[PDB]
Design an enzyme around this catalytic site. Structure first.
Site, PDB file in Angstrom:
ATOM      1  N   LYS A   1       0.840  -1.228   0.000  1.00 45.22           N
ATOM      2  CA  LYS A   1       0.000   0.000   0.000  1.00 45.22           C
ATOM      3  C   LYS A   1       0.851   1.245   0.000  1.00 45.22           C
ATOM      4  O   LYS A   1       0.387   2.313  -0.341  1.00 45.22           O
ATOM      5  CB  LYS A   1      -0.905   0.057   1.225  1.00 45.22           C
ATOM      6  CG  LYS A   1      -1.947  -1.073   1.213  1.00 45.22           C
ATOM      7  CD  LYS A   1      -2.849  -0.999  -0.029  1.00 45.22           C
ATOM      8  CE  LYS A   1      -4.120  -1.833   0.160  1.00 45.22           C
ATOM      9  NZ  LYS A   1      -3.803  -3.135   0.722  1.00 45.22           N
TER      10      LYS A   1
ATOM     11  N   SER B   1      -2.338 -12.982   3.396  1.00 40.96           N
ATOM     12  CA  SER B   1      -2.787 -12.904   2.009  1.00 40.96           C
ATOM     13  C   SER B   1      -1.695 -13.456   1.063  1.00 40.96           C
ATOM     14  O   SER B   1      -1.995 -13.997   0.015  1.00 40.96           O
ATOM     15  CB  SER B   1      -3.138 -11.477   1.651  1.00 40.96           C
ATOM     16  OG  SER B   1      -1.954 -10.706   1.619  1.00 40.96           O
TER      17      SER B   1
END
Ligand SMILES: CC[C@H](C)[C@H](N)C(=O)O
Lengths: 334, 336
Positions: free
Chosen positions: A57, A279
């Site tokens: 991010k 993830s």
């Protein structure tokens, strides 16, 4: 068995944001040692926790804020705002600290406390909303804040903002360059979908034949047309199809069980010494499932690893103690 | 004003150990904006948390294990052991995982339970010792296991192993290279002293006149010949002079108070957006004090940043909140 560490960068970075991107692509070996994964098949992981705040991010917080400033969507006197309890809020706080913009992050008061502390350390104002209301409660308060203060706020809007997707044109170029144009398949677990689509866009511009694989929790397989459900793969399975998602760019969607994702991540740190997040466990298992298909022999498979296991210590990631040999662990995964 | 992110590495790494080193050298700006710091002076931080397990020790755990394998001190059948509750433990676990050796890490049962879980994730055996005995208890246990099992273990010995110092010849080359020879001062907060000595050894070869500055807690100034004492700057202030320390390579030692180290680290994240750890707070404050000296105008000052603040969320680092504007904070830190 000669082993060389990394050479000097031969750059002086002007600030921390210039160290975003150019993340390393690393061969897997320990978890790929399986009779069905053939010798020529190459399984590579792109380690996005090499970014300054240790997640994918970083690229997103930076591009969203920097483009908004260049665009005039963010101007002096204005403040950044977003409802997020995760990596995006951290990335936005980093960008905001460097550019000199106040950052407001809204999230249910139930959340993090540790990510809250990270965001406060960066000088963020936190907007702790009602625990029972979850993320819809945070979003609601931000909307209430914008309405009560028109002109004041720039909303990051991570699921609807194309500057998210666009950041990953760099991600794609790095994959292309690092594999010398040999990449065949890219595997990306989907949260906002900025990575999978932005990577897909750019790579398909390079080579139409590249196979793009999205990964989502089996318990909340919304991309595959199922309903939002509870799941434990943090960072993905948003429970809706993001507005920035473009299904045309995605070739296959692989659902992965929460428990399998966690178990894969345990095996990766154990057998390759790579401490990936939850993830990543899902993305890697999907990639391993691709690597064992006979039609994929000899291909180059690249798997996005969005975060590091260290950010998950307060979770159940490393609770369960798996049993059996390595080959046994991998067999139960496949 | 153009901000450009990093270019592709153009490399596929054979394993995670190949991503160790080549860490970025970044300009500080926000925390350098104080009247007593001259515009021409360049204050740069070398961010050792860009290593795969986020600390300078990745270099050390790697080189210790690698050299031992190359020398024959580590051979199939043997296991790695060390008493450490810091980053060295994690670095050894990563090296051990990739080279395929068992790692045994001894620490007091009450220390760094986050770091405990990290180590167990890597497959390490933890040897948890009596809490109130602290680190001497863990050392005592490792000494016991060594004694009872002769030939079984390779001891990393981070405070006494020249392979620690030797790893920072790479650190030095990166500094030399990245600054195109212009580095004038290197500031390093001292734990094992691998960094400050290994960097000094190599840079003093390159150019006469590179000032090497060690940093230690004001409350435990043992390099300066003061008595050991309690301090809160994690990762430094070992309480003794490490066997690998070589005073001749060090030009100056700067004592920094614990609360100042923390306050500096808080300012760096808030005004430069760089989330550095406690010992980085100490090194940066020392480096800014250097940048204040009129004889240092126009010089290039390189400060080692060994770790990221994210590893410190359980400590009081960010609990204390500073009142005042940027200028008040910086002015209070350079106070005297
Ligand atoms: C001086 C203490 C050292 C630096 C620390 N305990 C470590 O081994 O990581």
């Amino acid at each position: 068995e000669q082993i060389s560490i990394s050479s000097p960068r031969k750059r002086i970075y002007h600030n921390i944001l210039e160290t975003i991107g150019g993340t390393p692509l690393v061969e897997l070996h320990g978890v790929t040692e399986h009779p069905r994964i053939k010798k020529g098949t190459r399984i590579l992981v792109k380690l996005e926790y090499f970014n300054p705040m240790s997640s994918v991010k970083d690229r997103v917080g930076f591009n969203i804020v920097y483009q908004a400033i260049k665009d005039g969507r963010l101007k002096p006197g204005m403040e950044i705002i977003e409802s997020t309890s995760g990596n995006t809020g951290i990335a936005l706080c980093q960008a905001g600290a460097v550019f000199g913009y106040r950052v407001n992050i809204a999230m249910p008061s139930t959340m993090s406390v540790e990510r809250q502390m990270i965001m406060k350390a960066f000088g963020a104002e936190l907007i702790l909303t009602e625990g029972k209301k979850g993320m819809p409660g945070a979003i609601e308060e931000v909307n209430k804040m914008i309405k009560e203060n028109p002109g004041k706020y720039f909303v990051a809007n991570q699921f609807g903002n194309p500057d998210n997707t666009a950041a990953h044109h760099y991600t794609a170029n790095e994959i292309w360059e690092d594999t010398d144009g040999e990449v065949d398949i890219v595997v990306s677990a989907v949260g906002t979908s900025g990575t999978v689509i932005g990577v897909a866009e750019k790579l398909k511009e390079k080579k139409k034949g590249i196979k793009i694989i999205a990964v989502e929790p089996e318990e909340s397989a919304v991309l595959e047309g199922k309903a939002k459900g509870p799941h434990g793969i943090q960072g993905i399975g948003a429970g809706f199809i993001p507005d920035i998602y473009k299904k045309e760019f995605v070739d296959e969607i692989i659902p992965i069980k929460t428990q399998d994702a966690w178990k894969m991540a345990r095996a990766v740190v154990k057998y390759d010494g790579i401490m990936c997040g939850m993830s990543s466990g899902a993305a890697i298992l999907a990639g391993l499932k691709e690597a064992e298909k006979p039609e994929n022999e000899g291909k180059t498979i690249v798997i996005i690893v969005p975060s590091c296991g260290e950010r998950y210590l307060s979770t159940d990631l490393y609770k369960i103690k798996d049993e059996g040999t390595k080959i046994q662990i991998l067999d139960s995964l496949l």
